[PDB]
């Protein structure tokens, strides 16, 4: 039983695991070391009668590849994910009255030219995501962007200088990012996954260039993206030291970071800004747009805007 263990059991239902560990690695051993890390952290809030804080770096912007997403704006995939996160907080509040809060710590601004989404696109996605939070009626979901960093106030509307403030204060050199990735199984698994997102972002259906050159480009840029994500994470550890650290990547079981799913999906690395919501057998699942078209998915529109597919 135990209030802290009940919170954790609620999260464990939606945990992202490394696909490589699902077939034969022992999930019970993973759970044991998760309990050691997460339980006193959750228990800290409960002992103080305070609401449980979660931090989640996520929802940066849609993939720039028109072959992967329906449009540049948040859609049914974001909508159901944000609604899920809100209901997770409500379920916790059922047994723990002070409840829980999830702050979405958007990393859209942290990347810059590394993922190749312009700052105007990021700002539009940011604004549209907040608006989506309001219309689903989510009250336990907050947003924290790079420009909300109180210490960086003067540079709030100068995006490149914001990025340089994050880098200057919180980034490790690329040589050290690389050394860390090469130090563990999971570091290399991360590096491979981030390379794949970048490569697939560049594989536009209209792309007619070299695939090999695209892969080599992605491999180099993946170090930078990790550097920024880790810098952002480090910044947020000082902003919100006690918060339970959620992630949209699978995480080592000994890590402070806890990977969490937001919609049913086969791919543990897949997130709503890199895919599409799919209605199939009267349930919503998240899939890659190319995969659903191959299965002969039908486009659904709501109002005048592309929304999701159906099977």
From Swiss-Prot:
It comes from the Bacteria. It catalyses: D-ribulose 5-phosphate + L-tyrosine = (2S)-3-(4-hydroxyphenyl)-2-isocyanopropanoate + hydroxyacetone + formaldehyde + phosphate + H2O + H(+). One of its GO terms (molecular function) is lyase activity. Its EC number is 4.1.99.24. InterPro entries: Isocyanide_synthase_DIT1, PvcA. Monomer in solution. Involved in the biosynthesis of paerucumarin, a cyclized isocyano derivative of tyrosine. Responsible for the synthesis of the isonitrile group on tyrosine using the C2 of ribulose 5-phosphate as the source of the carbon atom. This is L-tyrosine isonitrile synthase. It comes from Pseudomonas aeruginosa (strain ATCC 15692 / DSM 22644 / CIP 104116 / JCM 14847 / LMG 12228 / 1C / PRS 101 / PAO1). The gene is pvcA.
């Amino acid at each position: 039983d135990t209030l802290p263990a009940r919170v954790l059991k609620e999260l464990l239902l939606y945990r992202r695991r490394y696909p490589e560990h699902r077939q034969s690695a022992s999930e019970a051993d993973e759970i044991r070391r998760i309990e050691q890390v997460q339980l006193p952290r959750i228990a800290a809030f409960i002992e103080a009668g305070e609401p449980i804080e979660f931090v989640l770096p996520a929802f940066p912007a849609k993939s720039p590849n028109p072959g992967k997403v329906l449009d540049s704006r948040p859609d049914m995939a974001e909508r159901l994910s944000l609604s899920f996160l809100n209901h997770l907080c409500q379920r916790i509040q059922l047994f723990y009255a002070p409840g829980a809060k999830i702050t979405v710590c958007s990393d859209g601004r942290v990347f810059g030219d590394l993922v190749r989404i312009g700052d105007a696109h990021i700002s539009a996605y940011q604004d549209a995501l907040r608006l989506m939070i309001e219309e689903i009626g989510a009250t336990h979901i907050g947003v924290f962007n790079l420009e909300d960093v109180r210490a960086f106030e003067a540079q709030r509307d100068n995006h490149e200088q914001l990025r340089q403030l994050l880098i200057g204060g919180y980034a490790e050199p690329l040589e050290s990012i690389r050394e860390t990735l090469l130090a563990s199984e999971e570091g290399l698994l991360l590096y491979r996954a981030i390379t794949r997102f970048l490569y697939e972002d560049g594989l536009t259906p209209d792309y007619q260039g070299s695939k090999t050159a695209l892969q080599r480009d992605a491999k180099e840029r993946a170090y930078g993206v990790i550097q920024r994500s880790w810098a952002w994470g480090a910044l947020l550890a000082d902003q919100f030291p006690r918060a339970i650290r959620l992630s949209i990547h699978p995480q080592p079981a000994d890590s402070l970071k806890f990977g969490i799913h937001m919609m049913p999906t086969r791919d543990d690395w897949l997130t709503p800004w890199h895919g599409v919501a799919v209605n199939t057998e009267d349930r919503f699942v998240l899939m890659k747009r190319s995969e659903v078209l191959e299965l002969g998915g039908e486009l659904v529109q709501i109002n005048g805007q592309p929304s999701h597919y159906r099977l």
